[PDB]
Structure 1
Amino acid sequence: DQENERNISRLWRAFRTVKEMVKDRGYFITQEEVELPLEDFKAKYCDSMGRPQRKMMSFQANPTEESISKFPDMGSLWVEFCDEPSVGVKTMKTFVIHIQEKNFQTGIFVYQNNITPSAMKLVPSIPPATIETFNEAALVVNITHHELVPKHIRLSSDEKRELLKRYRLKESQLPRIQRADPVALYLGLKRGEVVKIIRKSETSGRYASYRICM
């Protein structure tokens, strides 16, 4: 038993947050799918010894009926976990061509410890598809859930064009969110994309700010 059980809890807490992020991005994930308990997680992805099988975890996600209204060209997503703590160019080439062949728009690599600089070179090698690398440990806790972290909302090309029209703005003039920003990553923001940040106010009650990506 020992301290094996804790890496299981962590991998599960990390999994919930992946489901959470994917649903939040605009992909169709059930609430019961998120709320899946630890006991059910073990009895699904744990082997004939209680050792978690990350290969099993990996899943495809599809755009919510709602998502195709705002963003029509929003394609399908593929989330890949790895039972190997270090991810090499051999495991990467499998996943990289998988997204290319299965005509995916986006793909997330939830790596355990590290992705070698050899394998990292394949990340931008297959456009119009996009690839994301997430260290399992960062996702144990969902940052979006935190007190100080307000509702960020991705804007459509039309929605942004309108925001700029309505405030007579050049993109320069908008407050900026960094591409690498924890939330910019969670949402999978790309350069030029705009977030509408709706925060509570001691002054107004509800205040809406906007940020353009870096």
Structure 2
Amino acid sequence: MDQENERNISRLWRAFRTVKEMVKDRGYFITQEEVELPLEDFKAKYCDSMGRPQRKMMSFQANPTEESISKFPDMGSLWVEFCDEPSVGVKTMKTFVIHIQEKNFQTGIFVYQNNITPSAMKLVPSIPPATIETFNEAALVVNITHHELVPKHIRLSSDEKRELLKRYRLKESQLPRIQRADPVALYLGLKRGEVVKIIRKSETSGRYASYRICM
């Protein structure tokens, strides 16, 4: 009983850390202090005296003006909201969508627990131009970017993509393609037509740069 609660608390803390790391990597403003939040502090703050995990971890991330706003002058605020229900419902996702629309958040990240309802998935792509992204706690327990087999992925802006296409004299279709359902694409929140930059290490040259288009 108690060991299951402790394991769930540890998994939730790891998922929260991974979510914070993903938000920081996407370009928003997250301090390095909150990223390595200790387990004891997490239990003290986000967990009540009884011990049940309370999914009150709601954060609003703002795009920094130092580099994020300068590179992409179209990023607003992010709203990541964990869900207390084990299996989410159509009505609850409707309230979540209304909550997102009320304060006109550009994008919102929703994390469920076990499974997602196809009825809610049908309305997931609604309410444009706001984008709603769904994630699983089990998939977010560990971070895939930190893996040694996953190279660094850097998003490219519209001007950078145009300059690359002009310099290399290529069309949009004449580039390597990455699926929109790829785990790295979901981690970075890539959209259709977005070009990402991959930096790897080879045994023939010290550094190698490759470009892929989300198609």
TM-score by length of 1: 0.96
Report the Cα distance in structure 2 between the residues aligned to 1:86 and 1:141, rounded to whole angstroms: 21
Identical-pair percentage:
100
Contact 2:154 2:196 in 1 (8 A): yes
1:133 is paired with a residue of what secondary structure? strand
Contact 1:28 1:63 in 2 (8 A): yes
CA RMSD of aligned residues (A): 1.3
Report the Cα distance in structure 1 between the residues aligned to 2:166 and 2:178, rounded to whole angstroms: 20
2:56 is paired with a residue of what secondary structure? helix
| Structure 1 residues 56-84: Cα deviation after superposition (integer angstroms, max 9, x where no partner) | 44544444531001101112111010111
| Structure 1 residues 141-166: Cα deviation after superposition (integer angstroms, max 9, x where no partner) | 00000001011011101110111111
What's the counterpart of residue 13 of structure 1? 14
Offset, 1:49? 1.1
Report the Cα distance in structure 1 between the residues aligned to 2:157 and 2:61, rounded to whole angstroms: 23
Shift in alpha-carbon separation, 1:64–1:35, aligned structure 2, 3 A: farther
Contact 1:59 1:80 in 2 (8 A): no
Report the Cα distance in structure 1 between the residues aligned to 2:139 and 2:41, rounded to whole angstroms: 23
Offset, 1:47? 1.9
| Structure 1 residues 72-116: Cα deviation after superposition (integer angstroms, max 9, x where no partner) | 111211101011110101211111011211111110001111221
2:109 is paired with a residue of what secondary structure? strand
Contact 1:63 1:74 in 2 (8 A): no
| Structure 1 residues 19-41: Cα deviation after superposition (integer angstroms, max 9, x where no partner) | 00000000000001101011111
Contact 2:197 2:209 in 1 (8 A): yes
Note the 1:169-184 alignment, pairs <5 A: 169-184=170-185
2:207 is paired with a residue of what secondary structure? strand
Report the Cα distance in structure 2 between the residues aligned to 1:64 and 1:47, rounded to whole angstroms: 36
| Structure 1 residues 160-196: Cα deviation after superposition (integer angstroms, max 9, x where no partner) | 0111111000011111111111101100000100001
Report the Cα distance in structure 2 between the residues aligned to 1:6 and 1:124, rounded to whole angstroms: 34
Equivalenced residue count is 214
Q: Provide structure 1 residue ranges, at least 5 long, that are not aligned to the other structure.
A: none
Contact 1:152 1:197 in 2 (8 A): yes
Runs of 4+, deviation exceeding 6 Å? none
Report the Cα distance in structure 2 between the residues aligned to 1:64 and 1:149, rounded to whole angstroms: 29
TM-score by length of 2: 0.95
Report the Cα distance in structure 1 between the residues aligned to 2:58 and 2:104, rounded to whole angstroms: 21
